[PDB]
Each structure stands twice: as C-alpha cells, then as structure tokens.
DNA sequence: AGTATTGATATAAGTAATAAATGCAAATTGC
DNA sequence: GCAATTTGCATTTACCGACAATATCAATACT
RNA sequence: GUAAAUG
C-alpha cells in the first residue's frame, strides 16, 4: 500500500487533513513498536523457549541457545539480589562513621534502586553481542569497554524509566558496576562441553565456564581480554539472532515531541540531549541552568519549526537507483559489485617495495569500496522500507548550536543520492513564481549559479529537450543528467520539469521538490556584518547589485593571476597548473578557512577535490600543499577586517586560558606557587545558548574493579584546560554559533509565517512557491540579528563575567616599579617566615575585595584602606606595553578593533544575498 | 695481544647510543678470574667467539688478549661505533662484521648460506668447547632483545641448537635484578623463571654496592661478585651495569606450553595459586584444585614457585583434555 | 601513629632502538 | 627571560595490524 | 587507526 500515492490522489484539503490525522494515529503504534527496547521481549522469548523444551521433553542442542540463556539468567538473578541486599544493609545504617570496612559503596548507591532483574539480560546480550567486536579473536572482547558498555547500557536503561515519568554517572562508577556485573555472570556461566582425553582417547563430558577472564599481551601491555567458549562461538554463529536491546535510530513516523527542556524532546520513547555534549559536566550544568531560567526558548522554537517538516521518499528516483543498484556495475556514485581483492604478484628490493605499494593501494581500494557499498546497502534498505510513509525528522544541536538530525543513517545531511531520494510530503501551488524558482533551482544544481537569474532561467529553457530525454530514458539514453554536479537532485528536478512541459498549464502543477536557497560563505557574510566592512560586503554579494559577484570566482581569479606570475618567474608546477585552477577547490579552501581549518585539513581538501580532476593521479598531496601555500596567502591578503577580528578573538582566548581564579585558589591547590589553569572560554549567543568550549587535558587513571583495574579517562574529574585547542577553536566556534543563531531565527520566523522550512546549516530549502517569502524572512532576520554590536557585547560580557580574575605574568624584578610589590611581599615574607607565596598573595587580594563585598561602612573604609600587590598594577594604563619574576596581573582584555560604517538596511535590497 | 682502546680514545667519541661500557683492565681481569672460564673449556685455544654489540670493544680486546681463541667475530650496526671499531682494529684477528643482531634474519643469513662464521656443532651432553658468544646489551632501550635471546634457547631455533654455549651478557643492573631474583623477591618474573628453566647464572660484576640489597643475600654469599667503582662507565648518565653468566642446561618439557602457562600465571604474581589458575583457561582453577596433590603449593605464591613446580603445572596442563589451543594468539 | 592515597616501574618481545632526516613552520611550552 | 617542542572547526557512517593497559611497590598523606 | 559523506 502506498500512503504517499493515496494522499497525492486525494485532491481536497479537508480529506487531506483527515488522511494526515488518520495516518498520525495509525503510525503511533508503529513508532512505539519500532522504538521498543528488547529488555522484555528477549526475556519472554527465552522463557517461552525453555517452556517449550520442558513440555516437549526432548533435548536439542541446536535450539538450546535460548534455553541456556534462560538457565544463566536463573543462576544469576539470586546473586545480584544478594548484592543488592548487601547494598541496602550497608548504606541504610544510621551511623556514618567508617569503621575500617573492606567495602566500597560508591557503586552501591549507583545500583541501589532497581538493578535486579533487567540487568542479566543486558550482561548476557552485550557480552554475546561483542563476539569479536574489538578484534580480540586472536572470540571475546576487551574488558575496558565491556565493563563500560554494561554501565552505559544501564545508564540508558535508568533513563528509560525516568522519561516514563545523578544527571551523568562518572566513568569510574560505570566501569565499577560493569565489572561487578560481568564477574557475577562469569561465576555462573556454565555450558556442556565434550573433549578427548589423551589418556583415554575418548570423549569426556562435563561443564566449563562459558566466559573465562584472561589477560593478553600486545606490544608490551596487559589488555585484559574477556574470552568466550568455542562451543558458544559455534552455537551463536549458526543462529544469527542478535536481538539487541537497543534498537537503531530511524526517521520518525509521528510528529516529534517539541523541545521543552534541555533533556526532553524528539523521539517519543527515547532520551535525547539538546546539546551533543560529548563528555563534560560544565556544559551540562550551564545548559541545565539556562533551561531552568528560560533564556533559549527561541532556540526551542527554531528547532521545533526545523523538525516539523514531513517528508517522503521519491518513488521514481528510487526505482532508477534500484535498477542501477541491481545492475551493480561501476557507476558514477554507487561503487558497484566487486568480487575479490586481486593479489599483486609476490616477488621472490625496489621490486619488493613496488609490490608493497601496490598491495597497500589495492587493500585501501578494497576497504573504500566495501565501506561505500555497506553504507549504500543500509541507506537503500531504509529507503525501500520507508516508501510511501511520513518521515518526520527531529533535529538536535551540537554544543555550538548548529542543528542536526537525530537519525544518522537516512537524512538530508547525506550525499547527493540521499538528498535526491527525499521530497516534501506537503504539496503547494506552484504558479509563475514557483516555475521560475524551480527552473533557477535546476540551473544552480547544474553548477551554473555564478550567472544572473535571467541567464539561469534562459539556460534551463534552453536544455528543454535534454531534460525531456534524460527523464524519458533514465539509462542508455543521452544521460545528460550525469553531466551535472548534483546527479540525483538533478534527476528529480528534471523529472518534474519534464512532467511540467508535458502539462499544458504550468500554474496548475503541484510540486514536491525542495528548492535550494543557499548562501556563499556565510562566515564571510557574518564577518562583514560584525566588522561593518563595506569592502567585504560588496565582495560577498551583501550590498545590492545587478549581478552577483562570486567570492569563489574572485579568489580564483586572484590565485590564477598569482600562479601566472609564478609561471612567468619559472615554476614548472605552476606552468602545469596555470590553466587548471578550479572554482571547486578554491571554493572549498576559502569556505573552510573561515571555519578555522588547519593546514593539513585544507591540503587534504584540495587533494580530495583535485584527484577526480586528475591533475595529479595518485600523489595528490604534493601538489595540494604547493597550492595551499599560495592560496592561504591570497585569502589573507584579500581579507583584512575578518583577519583582525579573528586575531582579537584568539588573543582574548589566550588571555582567558592563562587566567587564574581568586576564590578557588584561596585554598591551597597543593602545587604551591606553580598554578593550574582551570577556566574555559564561556559566553552567550544572541539567542542565549551558553557556548562552553570543551577542550581540556584528560589523562587516564586506573580505577579499581573486582575483575581488574580498568585504565580509563574520567571526564567527570576536574582537569586543566588546553590553551592551544581553545585558542584555535574560538573563532570558528563563535562564527558557527552565529550561523546557528541566524538559522534558528529564520526558521522561527518561517514557522510563524506558516511555511515548510528544512535547512542544512546556511543553505535553506522550501517549495518553489514560497522562495520569495523565505528570502524576505532571511534578509529581515539577518539584519535584525546584526543591527547591534555583537563583538562589543561579547567583550563587555567577558569583562562582566571575568571581572575578578588574575592573570599570571613574569615581569623583570629589577624594574623600578617593583618597589611597592617588593614591600608588600616583604611584609608578607616576614609574616610567612620565607619567600612570599602566590597563594598568600591571592588570599590577601581576595581579602581586599571581601571587605568591599559587605555594604557595611566600616568594611568599605578599611577595604579602601587595604593595599594589595594587584592594586599596584591597577595604576598602569597599558599593562601589556609595560610587560623576569612571576607576579600577579589583573585580567586585561584588549578593546574591540575599530568598527566600519555599514548598513544592514542597505544590504536588505540584495536579491543575490542567498541565491 | 691487541691494542686496547684507551680512555683518551673513548673520550673523543660522542654517540654511544645509550650503551654503557667499561674501560678497566684491572676490573676485567678480576672478572675473568672470578669467571674461571678455563675450567669448563678443557682446550680453550679452539674456542670460536662471536661477540654481539661489542660497542667500545675493550671487553673483546681483553678477552682475546687473555685467551687467544681461534676465530673471533664482532657484530654491530651503529655507524659511529663501527667507524671506531674499524679504525681501531685493522689487520688484527678481530673480525669486524657490520650486521644488526636485532634481526634473526641476520643470524639466518650468517649461519650457512654465506658461511660467514662456522659454529662447530655439539650435542646436549656437554657445554660446547668451540662456540662462544659475549653480548653487551647495556643499552636500556633494547632490553627485551634479551628476552628474545633467552627464549631462543628453549625454541632451539637460534644457534643454541649447536649445543650448550655460554653467553656472557653485560646487562643493565636493574635487568640483572629482574632476571636473578629468587622466590619471594620483588624482581622475580618471567625473566627469572625462564632463567631458572633454561640456564644457570653466576653474577660476576656490579657497579653500585648499594643495589646489592636487591639481590638475594645467600646468592651474594655464594657468588662474591667482582664489584667495581661506578666512575668507570663512560656515559655517567646511564644506570649501573651488571654482568651475568648463563650456561644452558638439559631440560625435559614442552617449550610452547611451558611459555603459555608461565606467562599467563606471572601476570598475577602476588595472588596465590588458589585463584590465579583461572587465567589459564576455562575451569582451570577448579580442575587444578582437584588434581594438585601438594596442598602447600596451592597456597604458595606464583612468585614463590620454582621451575620444578612450574614444570609440574605444565605436565598437569598437558594431562588436561579440555586444553584450549595455545596458538590462540 | 596509621591507615589511605598517589607516583613509578615493570610487562612482552619483532607494530625495535639510535640518529639521521624533515617540517607545516607556527603557536606552543620545555627550562 | 629564553630556548626547543607539539599539533591544530563541527558532525555522521563504515572498516581493520590496533587499541582508554594493568599489577605490584614505594613514598607520603591523610583521619 | 584508516576511509568516505556533509557545511
């Protein structure tokens, strides 16, 4: 049955609404079935199999897998009950004095509430699931994650009942609970086995422990493997019934739960976090505080509107891709069917090295083809299963703010074919605006976006017979569609235009294609508004203009001139590359540059986008680096205000990383005068999202567990910050936060208007009918966002938040200005009896502000009479200019670079803002 | 006699690669007197000596000046040290050979298809009177090369198929402590049990008298090492230097199974035998509890066991039918 | 005093070490 | 103050030469 | 660790 075809066949809006409601109600149950966790189904199945075996009365080893798992569950439940009883006897005692007991109760409170019955299911299922998951077959996994995976599984299991109504468990507690549960399972994991005694040469019948703990040496390190019995391996290999507890992530069928809190929102029976916080407690704490206060409600609204777009799968494109799929030949995007990895001939030393290179290249090609084919397998099975269904995508933000879909296998964030296999569920009246916009969409899909609007429409009109043929004969025809740059999207839109031309009146047509309104270098368009640079704005198509001035084309022209000069001076590689400078590669590099990309990443990108062009066939790195060395110079020489603003942000990041607290360091941190930096760059977006950079120095520490001491990195413990990473990460983090803010404001305004808005970061998608309204909304939201001085607001918020912070700086002691500080430390030295300590200096400085903290008059007057080492530095206007001996310096943040004179109301009338 | 490298000559050198040596003829002749090598070798003049990592070569010069063997070979790769050796031993019966003893391909190439050195072959009845090797592996970086060199005796895949040959082994003193420890001592490990199984040792020298507390007191009483001043190793940064004298002995067991049992038992070298046996395989603990007769052994520590008891454990492991494949790797 | 905690060294043994080569030099911290 | 040393925007998927390493033991910090 | 995808 085809729900999409039925809904299309219904012409009336009222019956369409009734159909949508009926399908929502009908698919509620299907969604619940799809999201059910296999913690009860596996137990019921095992009990059913055991009952069937008991009733039948005949022993069958092949079917005995579930019966054996039931036996393990029975032998393991009372022992976990005993451990829980030990817990509840231990913690509940009134006296809280430790009497030298040999027990640990940190995990006890962890597994106190419910961890009695559903647990052995998780341990059995996970330990069996990791058959050779960690390349431990030489069977078995690594205990390091085996204990944590059980803890992680319990984590999700505990949240399962909470959502049915201790935010984050430490990795130490996770490992502890996992190890105790696995050891308990190991005790009662018995299985029948037969072996031959060399004394008798006859089969010997008995029992053996199913899972035996052991340690394995690899290059000089104990690994702590957790092996599995060979008979069990044999039995599990045949059945191939994983029955995993946690179902995978698939596109929803019911309208997703709107975001309300930082913790609830999205899937109807699963926990999802508003931030993709990998592992950090500070981000979670600040996000929770922001949620409780209520200062990201507009972010909630933006995510709601971005996620409330219903989709479906494009049947015709699905049929075409399925046909080429079953053909399985070497095709443009899908790799094809490969049989075997051909072995290069093995020589019986230069020849040997050439053979080694060939072997490595062939193995790499094998791995790449296999990975691509497996992905394509999963994507196409999902599409095949989801034909004629409503596909709601609930979205989610990473820590910076950019919105992502929750389902990671089938989404419009994927490649070209994945995007093409998707169309809007809704249909809306196309009209003249829709016709023009959809023709423009195909024109820019073919890569001809750098040309004006009328020229694009003329191009689409011109290749009318080409569209007709490419849609009439998808294969073995002219195959003009493959000549494009976005093949499957081009195929879908061509299909639609061919049908339109076959229709007498284009106005009556009902459209489903998503029309692409993207932007060129959103990062540059945000530097332009931040710095007020008129030259940048007129370079990046921000000011109104008759024709769009493409930034990638401009930088390509500049690098072409540069390499022409290089060819004149005599570089052979420049001479070769004189005529083959590509907008694609220069675009990718320029676009990534604003994202704080590194040199290695950029040269990898140029090599990646140069290899298909085959300027150099295999050694793509050697030419890519040579291109980068000139391309970065060109970009930097063209862009000035952007560079100044990012330099200010990076310098501020450094001066924040090297900071020192006041209250925290008042208590001795046990390192004496040598301090421990513990402050991270933190600010609020215009929307209000607290953006805490997570970079820190994490070092692993062995945690005691019953099985062994697992060597894990505990993020929950306080660690120092990584100054290098934070400085390198501040500018792109800020810019991406601004992009996300613009994205979410635009989405909220579009939802208020009543549109369908699906967006991939900067690029925005809507039906061809409402492109005009979406463009107006885009421009209005951008100007509203950047009508105020965000960089100045950021600097004053840094000053407000980091007011009472003391940097560390090593000025020369011989400087005549040292006299006051020398006197202060000398009196402290007399009181201390030795050299003055930085901890005592911080304590005295805090005492100075402590007196001023109390509004009481005598507290203020004496506080005004107090003299500290820092107060000496408060008199210099330019401390950085003044700046050996280490001494306390107050936190000084440089003033914002000068702002230009730019007008967002002027940019508003630029049709080529987002083409 | 050959020209011994002088202290002034060794002073000019810069790249020792982390190898500590000695430059004392008095200390070396005292060491030789303690060794009393002529007792085992009835006819020393037919000895063939194959020196590994000669480095400075002073030890080799002393050895040759004292005994005057028949054939003498030195194996090295380091560029500066090879330059020194080649520049110092032109025309001498010292055979200066450039190969890296870290690779068994070097031995496999040197043994027969090139006939670089011809080791006279002997049976396992008596320690060889012809072939001999002296190795200086004081470089702390390459110390497991010793473990490979020592398991080679058991596998018999190295030259040790040629009979029973001594290999005097200059070792970092901490490695000597690890090898030479006795049961109940902190430094006993797989090195110690492999040593007890495949050879016997006599400590012959040590730099710092302070670390002698680490060794066994009774062993020191039996040995009486030739102690020398710690101001005699040219790189003063490195740790003190010890010497060991290993003589392979006849043994009766299966090397691979013995390696499996000992290696997987010495990981838990403090938890007694009542619990550590589980690590060998499934049901190993319960089976070996059922079968082991000497109930004192059941509580003796894995660091308190000796090679004889480990051989007993290997025999029981072989008698065990459910024995998982030792090529589990 | 006396347990408790943290830092260091070994473990296997062919994913070697030494120093000789290279890099992206620039932003970083070694001392 | 110098000097040599370490490594870099966000997310997602699949794969394998292969990944967060573990056990004493001593030196010292806690009630 | 490697490879691919997306902005």
mmCIF file with all atom_site columns, N, CA and C in Angstrom, chain B residues 152-197:
data_model
loop_
_atom_site.group_PDB
_atom_site.id
_atom_site.type_symbol
_atom_site.label_atom_id
_atom_site.label_alt_id
_atom_site.label_comp_id
_atom_site.label_asym_id
_atom_site.label_entity_id
_atom_site.label_seq_id
_atom_site.pdbx_PDB_ins_code
_atom_site.Cartn_x
_atom_site.Cartn_y
_atom_site.Cartn_z
_atom_site.occupancy
_atom_site.B_iso_or_equiv
_atom_site.pdbx_formal_charge
_atom_site.auth_seq_id
_atom_site.auth_comp_id
_atom_site.auth_asym_id
_atom_site.auth_atom_id
_atom_site.pdbx_PDB_model_num
ATOM 1   N N  . UNK B 1 152 ? 65.099 -18.049 22.860 1.00 0.00 ? 152 UNK B N  1
ATOM 2   C CA . UNK B 1 152 ? 65.707 -18.760 21.742 1.00 0.00 ? 152 UNK B CA 1
ATOM 3   C C  . UNK B 1 152 ? 66.344 -20.075 22.178 1.00 0.00 ? 152 UNK B C  1
ATOM 4   N N  . UNK B 1 153 ? 66.891 -20.139 23.395 1.00 0.00 ? 153 UNK B N  1
ATOM 5   C CA . UNK B 1 153 ? 67.428 -21.407 23.891 1.00 0.00 ? 153 UNK B CA 1
ATOM 6   C C  . UNK B 1 153 ? 66.336 -22.464 23.918 1.00 0.00 ? 153 UNK B C  1
ATOM 7   N N  . UNK B 1 154 ? 65.175 -22.111 24.466 1.00 0.00 ? 154 UNK B N  1
ATOM 8   C CA . UNK B 1 154 ? 64.092 -23.076 24.558 1.00 0.00 ? 154 UNK B CA 1
ATOM 9   C C  . UNK B 1 154 ? 63.562 -23.489 23.202 1.00 0.00 ? 154 UNK B C  1
ATOM 10  N N  . UNK B 1 155 ? 63.335 -22.515 22.323 1.00 0.00 ? 155 UNK B N  1
ATOM 11  C CA . UNK B 1 155 ? 62.862 -22.864 20.989 1.00 0.00 ? 155 UNK B CA 1
ATOM 12  C C  . UNK B 1 155 ? 63.922 -23.601 20.183 1.00 0.00 ? 155 UNK B C  1
ATOM 13  N N  . UNK B 1 156 ? 65.184 -23.544 20.607 1.00 0.00 ? 156 UNK B N  1
ATOM 14  C CA . UNK B 1 156 ? 66.320 -24.168 19.934 1.00 0.00 ? 156 UNK B CA 1
ATOM 15  C C  . UNK B 1 156 ? 66.483 -23.685 18.498 1.00 0.00 ? 156 UNK B C  1
ATOM 16  N N  . UNK B 1 157 ? 65.748 -22.644 18.108 1.00 0.00 ? 157 UNK B N  1
ATOM 17  C CA . UNK B 1 157 ? 65.788 -22.161 16.735 1.00 0.00 ? 157 UNK B CA 1
ATOM 18  C C  . UNK B 1 157 ? 67.032 -21.325 16.457 1.00 0.00 ? 157 UNK B C  1
ATOM 19  N N  . UNK B 1 158 ? 67.649 -20.766 17.492 1.00 0.00 ? 158 UNK B N  1
ATOM 20  C CA . UNK B 1 158 ? 68.834 -19.945 17.302 1.00 0.00 ? 158 UNK B CA 1
ATOM 21  C C  . UNK B 1 158 ? 70.008 -20.922 17.166 1.00 0.00 ? 158 UNK B C  1
ATOM 22  N N  . UNK B 1 159 ? 71.232 -20.428 17.327 1.00 0.00 ? 159 UNK B N  1
ATOM 23  C CA . UNK B 1 159 ? 72.440 -21.239 17.359 1.00 0.00 ? 159 UNK B CA 1
ATOM 24  C C  . UNK B 1 159 ? 72.398 -22.263 18.484 1.00 0.00 ? 159 UNK B C  1
ATOM 25  N N  . UNK B 1 160 ? 71.569 -22.025 19.507 1.00 0.00 ? 160 UNK B N  1
ATOM 26  C CA . UNK B 1 160 ? 71.553 -22.912 20.668 1.00 0.00 ? 160 UNK B CA 1
ATOM 27  C C  . UNK B 1 160 ? 71.174 -24.341 20.301 1.00 0.00 ? 160 UNK B C  1
ATOM 28  N N  . UNK B 1 161 ? 70.815 -24.583 19.041 1.00 0.00 ? 161 UNK B N  1
ATOM 29  C CA . UNK B 1 161 ? 70.755 -25.941 18.520 1.00 0.00 ? 161 UNK B CA 1
ATOM 30  C C  . UNK B 1 161 ? 72.139 -26.552 18.334 1.00 0.00 ? 161 UNK B C  1
ATOM 31  N N  . UNK B 1 162 ? 73.203 -25.765 18.483 1.00 0.00 ? 162 UNK B N  1
ATOM 32  C CA . UNK B 1 162 ? 74.565 -26.224 18.246 1.00 0.00 ? 162 UNK B CA 1
ATOM 33  C C  . UNK B 1 162 ? 75.207 -26.822 19.488 1.00 0.00 ? 162 UNK B C  1
ATOM 34  N N  . UNK B 1 163 ? 74.456 -26.953 20.578 1.00 0.00 ? 163 UNK B N  1
ATOM 35  C CA . UNK B 1 163 ? 74.956 -27.491 21.819 1.00 0.00 ? 163 UNK B CA 1
ATOM 36  C C  . UNK B 1 163 ? 74.620 -26.566 22.964 1.00 0.00 ? 163 UNK B C  1
ATOM 37  N N  . UNK B 1 164 ? 75.432 -26.637 24.014 1.00 0.00 ? 164 UNK B N  1
ATOM 38  C CA . UNK B 1 164 ? 75.285 -25.781 25.184 1.00 0.00 ? 164 UNK B CA 1
ATOM 39  C C  . UNK B 1 164 ? 76.418 -24.764 25.159 1.00 0.00 ? 164 UNK B C  1
ATOM 40  N N  . UNK B 1 165 ? 76.076 -23.503 24.914 1.00 0.00 ? 165 UNK B N  1
ATOM 41  C CA . UNK B 1 165 ? 77.057 -22.437 24.758 1.00 0.00 ? 165 UNK B CA 1
ATOM 42  C C  . UNK B 1 165 ? 76.783 -21.342 25.777 1.00 0.00 ? 165 UNK B C  1
ATOM 43  N N  . UNK B 1 166 ? 77.837 -20.907 26.460 1.00 0.00 ? 166 UNK B N  1
ATOM 44  C CA . UNK B 1 166 ? 77.745 -19.755 27.342 1.00 0.00 ? 166 UNK B CA 1
ATOM 45  C C  . UNK B 1 166 ? 77.520 -18.491 26.525 1.00 0.00 ? 166 UNK B C  1
ATOM 46  N N  . UNK B 1 167 ? 76.770 -17.552 27.095 1.00 0.00 ? 167 UNK B N  1
ATOM 47  C CA . UNK B 1 167 ? 76.680 -16.214 26.514 1.00 0.00 ? 167 UNK B CA 1
ATOM 48  C C  . UNK B 1 167 ? 76.806 -15.217 27.661 1.00 0.00 ? 167 UNK B C  1
ATOM 49  N N  . UNK B 1 168 ? 78.028 -14.730 27.880 1.00 0.00 ? 168 UNK B N  1
ATOM 50  C CA . UNK B 1 168 ? 78.262 -13.671 28.854 1.00 0.00 ? 168 UNK B CA 1
ATOM 51  C C  . UNK B 1 168 ? 77.522 -12.419 28.407 1.00 0.00 ? 168 UNK B C  1
ATOM 52  N N  . UNK B 1 169 ? 76.736 -11.839 29.308 1.00 0.00 ? 169 UNK B N  1
ATOM 53  C CA . UNK B 1 169 ? 75.728 -10.851 28.932 1.00 0.00 ? 169 UNK B CA 1
ATOM 54  C C  . UNK B 1 169 ? 75.836 -9.625  29.831 1.00 0.00 ? 169 UNK B C  1
ATOM 55  N N  . UNK B 1 170 ? 76.521 -8.589  29.351 1.00 0.00 ? 170 UNK B N  1
ATOM 56  C CA . UNK B 1 170 ? 76.506 -7.300  30.032 1.00 0.00 ? 170 UNK B CA 1
ATOM 57  C C  . UNK B 1 170 ? 75.083 -6.759  30.035 1.00 0.00 ? 170 UNK B C  1
ATOM 58  N N  . UNK B 1 171 ? 74.520 -6.561  31.219 1.00 0.00 ? 171 UNK B N  1
ATOM 59  C CA . UNK B 1 171 ? 73.126 -6.174  31.332 1.00 0.00 ? 171 UNK B CA 1
ATOM 60  C C  . UNK B 1 171 ? 72.988 -4.943  32.208 1.00 0.00 ? 171 UNK B C  1
ATOM 61  N N  . UNK B 1 172 ? 71.975 -4.117  31.962 1.00 0.00 ? 172 UNK B N  1
ATOM 62  C CA . UNK B 1 172 ? 71.626 -3.080  32.937 1.00 0.00 ? 172 UNK B CA 1
ATOM 63  C C  . UNK B 1 172 ? 71.316 -3.719  34.281 1.00 0.00 ? 172 UNK B C  1
ATOM 64  N N  . UNK B 1 173 ? 71.844 -3.114  35.347 1.00 0.00 ? 173 UNK B N  1
ATOM 65  C CA . UNK B 1 173 ? 71.776 -3.744  36.661 1.00 0.00 ? 173 UNK B CA 1
ATOM 66  C C  . UNK B 1 173 ? 70.341 -3.998  37.096 1.00 0.00 ? 173 UNK B C  1
ATOM 67  N N  . UNK B 1 174 ? 69.406 -3.133  36.700 1.00 0.00 ? 174 UNK B N  1
ATOM 68  C CA . UNK B 1 174 ? 68.004 -3.392  37.008 1.00 0.00 ? 174 UNK B CA 1
ATOM 69  C C  . UNK B 1 174 ? 67.504 -4.636  36.283 1.00 0.00 ? 174 UNK B C  1
ATOM 70  N N  . UNK B 1 175 ? 67.939 -4.840  35.038 1.00 0.00 ? 175 UNK B N  1
ATOM 71  C CA . UNK B 1 175 ? 67.572 -6.058  34.328 1.00 0.00 ? 175 UNK B CA 1
ATOM 72  C C  . UNK B 1 175 ? 68.211 -7.286  34.962 1.00 0.00 ? 175 UNK B C  1
ATOM 73  N N  . UNK B 1 176 ? 69.440 -7.155  35.464 1.00 0.00 ? 176 UNK B N  1
ATOM 74  C CA . UNK B 1 176 ? 70.052 -8.254  36.200 1.00 0.00 ? 176 UNK B CA 1
ATOM 75  C C  . UNK B 1 176 ? 69.249 -8.582  37.449 1.00 0.00 ? 176 UNK B C  1
ATOM 76  N N  . UNK B 1 177 ? 68.761 -7.555  38.145 1.00 0.00 ? 177 UNK B N  1
ATOM 77  C CA . UNK B 1 177 ? 67.902 -7.790  39.300 1.00 0.00 ? 177 UNK B CA 1
ATOM 78  C C  . UNK B 1 177 ? 66.629 -8.522  38.897 1.00 0.00 ? 177 UNK B C  1
ATOM 79  N N  . UNK B 1 178 ? 66.019 -8.116  37.782 1.00 0.00 ? 178 UNK B N  1
ATOM 80  C CA . UNK B 1 178 ? 64.799 -8.779  37.324 1.00 0.00 ? 178 UNK B CA 1
ATOM 81  C C  . UNK B 1 178 ? 65.058 -10.240 36.974 1.00 0.00 ? 178 UNK B C  1
ATOM 82  N N  . UNK B 1 179 ? 66.187 -10.525 36.325 1.00 0.00 ? 179 UNK B N  1
ATOM 83  C CA . UNK B 1 179 ? 66.480 -11.898 35.923 1.00 0.00 ? 179 UNK B CA 1
ATOM 84  C C  . UNK B 1 179 ? 66.836 -12.776 37.116 1.00 0.00 ? 179 UNK B C  1
ATOM 85  N N  . UNK B 1 180 ? 67.639 -12.261 38.041 1.00 0.00 ? 180 UNK B N  1
ATOM 86  C CA . UNK B 1 180 ? 68.334 -13.092 39.012 1.00 0.00 ? 180 UNK B CA 1
ATOM 87  C C  . UNK B 1 180 ? 67.588 -13.244 40.328 1.00 0.00 ? 180 UNK B C  1
ATOM 88  N N  . UNK B 1 181 ? 66.371 -12.724 40.429 1.00 0.00 ? 181 UNK B N  1
ATOM 89  C CA . UNK B 1 181 ? 65.651 -12.792 41.689 1.00 0.00 ? 181 UNK B CA 1
ATOM 90  C C  . UNK B 1 181 ? 65.229 -14.225 42.003 1.00 0.00 ? 181 UNK B C  1
ATOM 91  N N  . UNK B 1 182 ? 65.053 -14.488 43.288 1.00 0.00 ? 182 UNK B N  1
ATOM 92  C CA . UNK B 1 182 ? 64.631 -15.772 43.813 1.00 0.00 ? 182 UNK B CA 1
ATOM 93  C C  . UNK B 1 182 ? 63.208 -15.674 44.350 1.00 0.00 ? 182 UNK B C  1
ATOM 94  N N  . UNK B 1 183 ? 62.538 -16.805 44.588 1.00 0.00 ? 183 UNK B N  1
ATOM 95  C CA . UNK B 1 183 ? 61.132 -16.747 45.004 1.00 0.00 ? 183 UNK B CA 1
ATOM 96  C C  . UNK B 1 183 ? 60.935 -15.911 46.259 1.00 0.00 ? 183 UNK B C  1
ATOM 97  N N  . UNK B 1 184 ? 59.849 -15.142 46.266 1.00 0.00 ? 184 UNK B N  1
ATOM 98  C CA . UNK B 1 184 ? 59.552 -14.227 47.346 1.00 0.00 ? 184 UNK B CA 1
ATOM 99  C C  . UNK B 1 184 ? 60.203 -12.867 47.235 1.00 0.00 ? 184 UNK B C  1
ATOM 100 N N  . UNK B 1 185 ? 60.984 -12.622 46.188 1.00 0.00 ? 185 UNK B N  1
ATOM 101 C CA . UNK B 1 185 ? 61.675 -11.356 45.998 1.00 0.00 ? 185 UNK B CA 1
ATOM 102 C C  . UNK B 1 185 ? 60.973 -10.535 44.925 1.00 0.00 ? 185 UNK B C  1
ATOM 103 N N  . UNK B 1 186 ? 61.053 -9.210  45.069 1.00 0.00 ? 186 UNK B N  1
ATOM 104 C CA . UNK B 1 186 ? 60.223 -8.314  44.270 1.00 0.00 ? 186 UNK B CA 1
ATOM 105 C C  . UNK B 1 186 ? 60.501 -8.418  42.776 1.00 0.00 ? 186 UNK B C  1
ATOM 106 N N  . UNK B 1 187 ? 61.725 -8.768  42.393 1.00 0.00 ? 187 UNK B N  1
ATOM 107 C CA . UNK B 1 187 ? 62.130 -8.716  40.997 1.00 0.00 ? 187 UNK B CA 1
ATOM 108 C C  . UNK B 1 187 ? 61.950 -10.040 40.263 1.00 0.00 ? 187 UNK B C  1
ATOM 109 N N  . UNK B 1 188 ? 61.327 -11.036 40.888 1.00 0.00 ? 188 UNK B N  1
ATOM 110 C CA . UNK B 1 188 ? 61.093 -12.312 40.224 1.00 0.00 ? 188 UNK B CA 1
ATOM 111 C C  . UNK B 1 188 ? 59.952 -12.185 39.224 1.00 0.00 ? 188 UNK B C  1
ATOM 112 N N  . UNK B 1 189 ? 60.161 -12.710 38.021 1.00 0.00 ? 189 UNK B N  1
ATOM 113 C CA . UNK B 1 189 ? 59.172 -12.600 36.956 1.00 0.00 ? 189 UNK B CA 1
ATOM 114 C C  . UNK B 1 189 ? 59.477 -13.643 35.884 1.00 0.00 ? 189 UNK B C  1
ATOM 115 N N  . UNK B 1 190 ? 58.838 -13.475 34.723 1.00 0.00 ? 190 UNK B N  1
ATOM 116 C CA . UNK B 1 190 ? 59.053 -14.391 33.611 1.00 0.00 ? 190 UNK B CA 1
ATOM 117 C C  . UNK B 1 190 ? 60.527 -14.489 33.247 1.00 0.00 ? 190 UNK B C  1
ATOM 118 N N  . UNK B 1 191 ? 61.269 -13.384 33.361 1.00 0.00 ? 191 UNK B N  1
ATOM 119 C CA . UNK B 1 191 ? 62.718 -13.452 33.204 1.00 0.00 ? 191 UNK B CA 1
ATOM 120 C C  . UNK B 1 191 ? 63.323 -14.467 34.160 1.00 0.00 ? 191 UNK B C  1
ATOM 121 N N  . UNK B 1 192 ? 62.946 -14.386 35.437 1.00 0.00 ? 192 UNK B N  1
ATOM 122 C CA . UNK B 1 192 ? 63.539 -15.260 36.439 1.00 0.00 ? 192 UNK B CA 1
ATOM 123 C C  . UNK B 1 192 ? 63.216 -16.723 36.172 1.00 0.00 ? 192 UNK B C  1
ATOM 124 N N  . UNK B 1 193 ? 61.962 -17.035 35.837 1.00 0.00 ? 193 UNK B N  1
ATOM 125 C CA . UNK B 1 193 ? 61.625 -18.440 35.614 1.00 0.00 ? 193 UNK B CA 1
ATOM 126 C C  . UNK B 1 193 ? 62.248 -18.963 34.327 1.00 0.00 ? 193 UNK B C  1
ATOM 127 N N  . UNK B 1 194 ? 62.312 -18.141 33.279 1.00 0.00 ? 194 UNK B N  1
ATOM 128 C CA . UNK B 1 194 ? 62.990 -18.583 32.065 1.00 0.00 ? 194 UNK B CA 1
ATOM 129 C C  . UNK B 1 194 ? 64.467 -18.822 32.348 1.00 0.00 ? 194 UNK B C  1
ATOM 130 N N  . UNK B 1 195 ? 65.066 -17.975 33.188 1.00 0.00 ? 195 UNK B N  1
ATOM 131 C CA . UNK B 1 195 ? 66.456 -18.169 33.582 1.00 0.00 ? 195 UNK B CA 1
ATOM 132 C C  . UNK B 1 195 ? 66.640 -19.485 34.325 1.00 0.00 ? 195 UNK B C  1
ATOM 133 N N  . UNK B 1 196 ? 65.794 -19.743 35.324 1.00 0.00 ? 196 UNK B N  1
ATOM 134 C CA . UNK B 1 196 ? 65.917 -20.975 36.099 1.00 0.00 ? 196 UNK B CA 1
ATOM 135 C C  . UNK B 1 196 ? 65.708 -22.197 35.220 1.00 0.00 ? 196 UNK B C  1
ATOM 136 N N  . UNK B 1 197 ? 64.785 -22.106 34.264 1.00 0.00 ? 197 UNK B N  1
ATOM 137 C CA . UNK B 1 197 ? 64.495 -23.246 33.406 1.00 0.00 ? 197 UNK B CA 1
ATOM 138 C C  . UNK B 1 197 ? 65.646 -23.532 32.455 1.00 0.00 ? 197 UNK B C  1
#
